[PDB]
Design an enzyme around this catalytic site. Structure first.
Site, mmCIF file in Angstrom:
data_model
loop_
_atom_site.group_PDB
_atom_site.id
_atom_site.type_symbol
_atom_site.label_atom_id
_atom_site.label_comp_id
_atom_site.label_asym_id
_atom_site.label_seq_id
_atom_site.Cartn_x
_atom_site.Cartn_y
_atom_site.Cartn_z
ATOM 1 N N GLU A 235 4.971 7.058 -5.719
ATOM 2 C CA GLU A 235 3.676 7.018 -6.449
ATOM 3 C C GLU A 235 3.405 8.334 -7.185
ATOM 4 O O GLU A 235 2.460 9.050 -6.876
ATOM 5 C CB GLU A 235 2.554 6.655 -5.478
ATOM 6 C CG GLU A 235 2.823 5.351 -4.754
ATOM 7 C CD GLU A 235 1.598 4.617 -4.251
ATOM 8 O OE1 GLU A 235 0.591 5.297 -3.976
ATOM 9 O OE2 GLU A 235 1.657 3.359 -4.138
ATOM 10 N N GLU A 340 7.461 -1.136 -1.975
ATOM 11 C CA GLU A 340 6.355 -0.976 -1.005
ATOM 12 C C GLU A 340 5.330 -2.092 -1.207
ATOM 13 O O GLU A 340 4.818 -2.244 -2.330
ATOM 14 C CB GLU A 340 5.688 0.392 -1.173
ATOM 15 C CG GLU A 340 4.771 0.772 -0.039
ATOM 16 C CD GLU A 340 4.019 2.067 -0.282
ATOM 17 O OE1 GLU A 340 4.624 3.044 -0.725
ATOM 18 O OE2 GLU A 340 2.638 2.065 0.018
ATOM 19 N N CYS A 342 1.871 -3.729 1.163
ATOM 20 C CA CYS A 342 1.069 -3.855 2.397
ATOM 21 C C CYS A 342 -0.310 -4.412 2.063
ATOM 22 O O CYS A 342 -0.691 -4.406 0.873
ATOM 23 C CB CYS A 342 0.988 -2.540 3.163
ATOM 24 S SG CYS A 342 0.024 -1.277 2.302
ATOM 25 N N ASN A 370 6.805 -12.263 -7.643
ATOM 26 C CA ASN A 370 7.799 -11.199 -7.939
ATOM 27 C C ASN A 370 9.150 -11.837 -8.305
ATOM 28 O O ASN A 370 9.732 -11.431 -9.335
ATOM 29 C CB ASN A 370 7.917 -10.191 -6.790
ATOM 30 C CG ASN A 370 6.871 -9.097 -6.851
ATOM 31 O OD1 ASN A 370 7.200 -7.940 -7.096
ATOM 32 N ND2 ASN A 370 5.603 -9.438 -6.670
HETATM 33 C C1 LIG Z 1 1.696 2.882 -0.687
HETATM 34 C C2 LIG Z 1 1.717 4.373 -0.352
HETATM 35 O O1 LIG Z 1 2.887 5.035 -0.881
HETATM 36 C C3 LIG Z 1 1.600 4.583 1.149
HETATM 37 O O2 LIG Z 1 1.686 5.985 1.467
HETATM 38 C C4 LIG Z 1 0.275 4.030 1.652
HETATM 39 O O3 LIG Z 1 0.242 4.136 3.081
HETATM 40 C C5 LIG Z 1 0.066 2.564 1.266
HETATM 41 C C6 LIG Z 1 -1.329 2.091 1.705
HETATM 42 O O4 LIG Z 1 -2.338 2.863 1.066
HETATM 43 C C7 LIG Z 1 0.372 2.259 -0.220
HETATM 44 N N1 LIG Z 1 -0.670 2.608 -1.160
HETATM 45 C C8 LIG Z 1 -0.831 1.841 -2.273
HETATM 46 O O5 LIG Z 1 -0.130 0.861 -2.556
HETATM 47 C C9 LIG Z 1 -1.916 2.236 -3.244
HETATM 48 C C10 LIG Z 1 -3.272 1.686 -2.866
HETATM 49 C C11 LIG Z 1 -4.042 1.185 -4.090
HETATM 50 C C12 LIG Z 1 -4.901 2.269 -4.690
#
Ligand SMILES: *[C@@H]1[C@H](O)[C@@H](O)[C@H](O)[C@@H](CO)[C@H]1NC(=O)CCCC
Ligand SMILES: [C][C]1[C]C([C])=C2[C]([C][C][C][C]C3=[C]N([C][C]4[C]([O])[C]([O])[C]([O])[C]5O[C]45)N=N3)C3=C([C])[C]=C([C])N3[B](F)(F)N12
Ligand SMILES: *[C@@H]1O[C@H](CO)[C@@H](O[C@@H]2O[C@H](CO)[C@@H](O)[C@H](O)[C@H]2NC(C)=O)[C@H](O)[C@H]1NC(C)=O
Ligand SMILES: *[C@@H]1O[C@H](CO)[C@@H](O[C@@H]2O[C@H](CO)[C@@H](O)[C@H](O)[C@H]2NC(C)=O)[C@H](O)[C@H]1NC(C)=O
Ligand SMILES: *[C@@H]1[C@H](O)[C@@H](O)[C@H](O)[C@@H](CO)[C@H]1NC(=O)CCCC
Ligand SMILES: *[C@@H]1O[C@H](CO)[C@@H](O)[C@H](O)[C@H]1NC(C)=O
Ligand SMILES: *[C@@H]1O[C@H](CO)[C@@H](O)[C@H](O)[C@H]1NC(C)=O
Lengths: 497, 497
Positions: A235, A340, A342, A370
């Protein structure tokens, strides 16, 4: 096989309860006889990847939904599916008794689990860590003389990766991503907040940071682990934001372009790790296609970039066609890879919702979207969290397919685990997406692929409350007559010769 | 005129402090001769809509960015600017002593202030209420014999709207929007959560809900208030989300289409309120163009829809061109209107940041982008909140351009107030956006409009840290030589003959 031991926590569906002596598991993989299909079914009502078989019919009549396989319409080849070995995941897994640890790893990596073939490895600390460290915290160590792997690597992450690879029958690909550099390489001198590398691409700060990638790969190679790929930065857009709460390193697309061209590309190419792939972006797909255009229209950068890594965060998604679709159209020879995914929560939802069918359906819908927009692979975030969605040093708690309850020497397999399994277990590396047309408008999500051996796989998701009668036509073999029940996911498999 | 009394709360800029006996204010508008311009300047360094004048000259001394007015290139006409008279806003304003109340209302509505000409009025309770109520909570009252306004309307909102209209130099337009129906009309029998109207368009539930709109307009008309427009529902997509925490009513675009065609359109058309405009969507612009296509391609719905109302909360996921631009291309005779914006609602946003220059720049950047993509009006959310960003019955605390500290009989005018004012004060109803051509690539946001009387207005926002030398050319008058300082917003006004 061993069935799911179901437990309700009062949400829409059940978790499957595992402990030191019991975990739900598959029989070894079987292929259905030609003229027959295999069906794996999971339902909100509690079915968990249950196996059945039916006949392929020569003839079909009726007004019902028909999905026609187009096996000559060929799209992307699949790299694979997996999740992230974070400090938090490794800490939670290794807090279980050894037999429970083995059943958790078998759930993910065994052919009697869901056949993961990707592990994402953070390069030092992220939010899913219990402290901030890098591999080179001695200030102004430009030679990286004090570069070393701490216990988080040597005692938690590396031993679990070795155990995962021993349990897998499929070759497993490792992917590495850094969140922060050493603070002495950064304009703001902190692991978090708004800040980029000091100076300009080509200079000592940028060359040191590129050499840190090579030192990381050297140190893992000493532990007999080799990487398939690295990302240029986790990111990069995060380090451009004032008050960014956890480990980050800001790059504009121009800064990433020039860092790859001048420093990271040449440094990796001249190393013993020259066969390791470089993925750019590793960020929200809202940044596409602009980020891809900036980096890949520069031939000095483009020659080092194998792929574009994208992130999925359920609550905040840009439309797939304008981002993934348009990027593929501009750069068709540069693979898209989901690095990534979640489920975070709104102010009104808990970080972990034990037994949430909704969060399961969100993962599988996402995976299908996707795959329909050229993405070659899909990587979950933390392999396991505690019931709070941690640990996490900034309390950025999220959900995970496996929740560990250390006090009970127990782990819970969420609906997300099975929704991911409907893809990961049945779509091996080298599988190719093929066309699948509907005869009429319908509420289903579906995707078709062909295995390397030429056999078929179709995943059908029903996020509606209504049963949908369905026929799949394959011109080579005939008609699969079936029903997609409300709040179900099915995987269909059949031989074509 | 009285200047800003600045106060820092440790954020990037100052608030202006007002109390019972002091508020910063303008002199009556006084505009100079042909060949003279007026400039209003606000800066992070603390200037607040400060007036200066200078020459428009025959000779061009600048060698940097040129912005050329193209008055023959004509776009949308402006409806106007304002904010929402929520229960929360009315409670906060009426907690001040009457002299302080009058200075707050003059700040928004007077020519001594920023000349608001739009007020959005919730139809009964929303999150910015201290309780749950509708106008017809007595069950199975399908003829709405027990429909009535509570004290929130008759004691708080209506008297403040009367006072706003008394103080306004411009005619003020009222816009109404409902959050929830009576719960006995809903599938889930609850003020919040996943739930829609019972049954199907044309039935008793849908006719009762349409009749509730007429009853509301009748009740406000008895208090001598008439509406310019109503929206078909606030954020209809919210009531499709399981567990939605506050007042909502779910409509798919198909349900909204059929409700408008069968019930709301015909009911409003058959009433004494047939001249009230109906706006559709009233939701995130990420739902465009799809929602517009579903509703407006049905002639039986489209004939009742005057416009499309948009909210700003997912703008970062949805480029203006793909949403506002594409919607205008498909439906060029259906006006776009921005009906709700605020900062402090995201999990990464602290609710209130007193003196935030960043939050000011977010408002002005949004207004400029909207105006460059055919939007005719822009409506803030709560007119005033307390220092926590409340009250709010689900603790959904957010920021507001005016923060009231009732314990000190004090209110604070935030940078957002002045950023909105740079548009609201200087772009009266019927102003038309015209061409403004940039001579080269630059970091400024700029928009040009022409007043009904033919005079020019240009707004220039600099979100960069660097001063930008600027020339503005009017082909009929000559060259305006200026500088756009880093972290500034300017409004330029001049006679063209
Ligand atoms: C992806 C990040 O790299 C990770 O470090 C975070 O734990 C996880 C949850 O916040 C991921 N974040 C995101 O995808 C961004 C959230 C949207 C603003
Ligand atoms: C713990 C959680 C988890 C998490 C991801 C955050 C964050 C980070 C939130 C990121 C919000 C965001 C906005 N955008 C879009 C935005 C885009 O419009 C820009 O043009 C791009 O350059 C860049 O991509 C960014 N993408 N992500 C945060 C900030 C920025 C401030 C705080 C307090 N927090 B937090 F709440 F702590 N927190
Ligand atoms: C681990 O989980 C298993 C499966 O739920 C538990 O085994 C069950 O135990 C109950 C109560 O003793 C028996 O009635 C069941 O017949 C058992 N089922 C099976 C399939 O063996 C086991 O007790 C759990 N271990 C711990 C320590 O709680
Ligand atoms: C309301 O705000 C005004 C302006 O800040 C305050 O007026 C100042 O009061 C002090 C003495 O208390 C004077 O010396 C200043 O000259 C005043 N300024 C002006 C411009 O009049 C006023 O005190 C505030 N009201 C209260 C109750 O604190
Ligand atoms: C708009 C809503 O109508 C209002 O009730 C809220 O108070 C306000 C701030 O939360 C706005 N809604 C949202 O922010 C919704 C979330 C964005 C997708
Ligand atoms: C760096 O490493 C060397 C060799 O192990 C050690 O002697 C030295 O003290 C270290 N310096 C630090 C940690 O500052
Ligand atoms: C509703 O109004 C009717 C008169 O129109 C009245 O008789 C009835 O009692 C009212 N119900 C309530 C609960 O106020």
């Amino acid at each position: 096989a061993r069935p799911c031991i179901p437990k309700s926590f009062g949400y829409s569906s059940v978790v499957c309860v595992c402990n030191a002596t019991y975990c739900d598991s598959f029989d070894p993989p079987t292929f259905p006889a030609l003229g027959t299909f295999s069906r794996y079914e999971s339902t909100r009502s509690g079915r968990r990847m249950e196996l059945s078989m039916g006949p392929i019919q020569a003839n079909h009549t009726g007004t019902g939904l028909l999905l026609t396989l187009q096996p000559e319409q060929k799209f992307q080849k699949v790299k694979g599916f997996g999740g992230a070995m974070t400090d938090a995941a490794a800490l939670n897994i290794l807090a279980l008794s050894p037999p429970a640890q083995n059943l958790l790893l078998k759930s993910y990596f065994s052919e009697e689990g869901i056949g993961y073939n990707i592990i994402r490895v953070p390069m030092a600390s992220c939010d899913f860590s219990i402290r901030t460290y890098t591999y080179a915290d001695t200030p102004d160590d430009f030679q990286l003389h004090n570069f070393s792997l701490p216990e988080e690597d040597t005692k938690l992450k590396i031993p679990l990766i070795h155990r995962a690879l021993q349990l897998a029958q499929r070759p497993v690909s490792l992917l590495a991503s850094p969140w922060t550099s050493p603070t002495w390489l950064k304009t703001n001198g902190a692991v978090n907040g708004k800040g980029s590398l000091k100076g300009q691409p080509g200079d000592i700060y940028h060359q040191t940071w590129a050499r840190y990638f090579v030192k990381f790969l050297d140190a893992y190679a000493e532990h007999k682990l080799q990487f398939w790929a690295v990302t240029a930065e986790n990111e990069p857009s995060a380090g451009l934001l004032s008050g960014y709460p956890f480990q980050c390193l800001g790059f504009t697309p121009e800064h990433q372009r020039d860092f790859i061209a001048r420093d990271l590309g040449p440094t990796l190419a001249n190393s013993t790790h020259h066969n390791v792939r470089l993925l750019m972006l590793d960020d929200q797909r809202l940044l596409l296609p602009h980020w891809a255009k900036v980096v890949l229209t520069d031939p000095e950068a483009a020659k080092y970039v194998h792929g574009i890594a994208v992130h999925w965060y359920l609550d905040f998604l840009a439309p797939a066609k304008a981002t993934l679709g348009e990027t593929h159209r501009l750069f068709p020879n540069t693979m898209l890879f989901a690095s990534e995914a979640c489920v975070g929560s709104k102010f009104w939802e808990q970080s972990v919702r034990l037994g949430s069918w909704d969060r399961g359906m969100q993962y599988s819908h996402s995976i299908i979207t996707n795959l329909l927009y050229h993405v070659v692979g899909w990587t979950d975030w933390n392999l396991a969290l505690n019931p709070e969605g941690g640990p996490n040093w900034v309390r950025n708690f999220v959900d995970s397919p496996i929740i560990v309850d250390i006090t009970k020497d127990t782990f819970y397999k969420q609906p997300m685990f099975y929704h991911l399994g409907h893809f990961s277990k049945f779509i091996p590396e080298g599988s190719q997406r093929v066309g699948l047309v509907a005869s009429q408008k319908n509420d289903l999500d579906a995707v078709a692929l062909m295995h390397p051996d030429g056999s078929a796989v179709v995943v059908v998701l029903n996020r509606s409350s209504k049963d949908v009668p369905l026929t799949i036509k394959d011109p080579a073999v005939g008609f699969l007559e079936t029903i997609s029940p409300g709040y179900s996911i099915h995987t269909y498999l059949w031989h074509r010769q």
